[PDB]
Amino acid sequence: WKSGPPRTRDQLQTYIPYLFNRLANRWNLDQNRDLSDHGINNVVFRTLSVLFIYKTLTVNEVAVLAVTEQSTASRMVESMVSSGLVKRERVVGLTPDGEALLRKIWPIMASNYDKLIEGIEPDDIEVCARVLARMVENIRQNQI
Amino acid sequence: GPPRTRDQLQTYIPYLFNRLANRWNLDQNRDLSDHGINNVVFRTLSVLFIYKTLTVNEVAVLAVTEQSTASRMVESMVSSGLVKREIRRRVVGLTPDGEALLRKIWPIMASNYDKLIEGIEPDDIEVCARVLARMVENIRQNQI
């Protein structure tokens, strides 16, 4: 888009920053609504998810991988320790209750993901993910 | 079951579009701050550059902000000379000065976009955008 901003609706439909912003907003709103039933929010869920994958992380790494501000991540990790989902091993990990909670919330999350990908070929999903992953490599400030 | 491994997380589109949107928006706000602009004003200019007129609530959808934030920023943009109120409700239109400002500051965002798409082929950009646009159609609550 060297010569100028996207100018028509058809051009906007090809402008990836608009698309990932509109998507992230609606996905996160819907997810936060569903998570409210469990008394947690997106940041807590994303923290459970990345601790499930990595087992232990520092609070700084949680902030990066769960995509939240460092100050918000430290306060939320303390909240999650108080509520028995995370333990302090500055590295933290899941408690059994934290893993159980992730497991119990995943059916609804999987249903939301199924709706997200309706009408999209698996090969196109793979190309889209490869593109977005390289974009993350291009602009991330933290190399994790 | 949730993404369980690092490789799975690296291919998980909701993680990717959240991490991307966060860093892109933070960078954009930082780079625009020197020009007295924020994310919402810039994205409002950007979508009125396409549509010319929109209601405030439509601006909130397409510029991806809260309705209340959009209303306050639109009023600021009236004082900035960048939009004008029109006569169904809360209609605003881009002024020639608003168009000129967007064209003037665009090279900053074009630079950021060039960084974003480094190492990504045009055909893969096209596939990525088509996937994300269908995802928007699948989950959007507003039919704009």
Author numbering:
A (entry chain A): 9 to 97, 106 to 160
B (entry chain B): 12 to 98, 104 to 160
Sentences from the paper on this structure:
We characterize the binding of IAA to MarR-family regulators from both iac and iad loci. Most characterized MarR-family regulators function as repressors by binding to an operator sequence upstream of the genes they control. When a relevant ligand binds the MarR repressor, it releases from DNA, allowing gene expression. The structures of MarRs from representatives of each auxin degradation operon type establish that each has distinct IAA-binding pockets.
MarR proteins were produced from three iad and three iac loci and their binding affinities for IAA were measured. The strongest binding to IAA was observed for the IadR MarRs from iad loci, with MarR_3CDH from Ruegeria pomeroyi having the highest affinity (KD of 0.237 ± 0.099 µM). Crystal structures for the IAA-binding IacR MarRs from P. putida, E. soli and A. baumannii and IadR MarR from B. japonicum were determined and refined to 1.5–2.8 Å resolution. As with the V. paradoxus MarR_50, the secondary IadR2 MarR from B. japonicum (MarR_Bj2) did not bind to IAA. We also provide crystal structures of MarR regulators from P. putida, E. soli, Bradyrhizobium japonicum and A. baumannii.
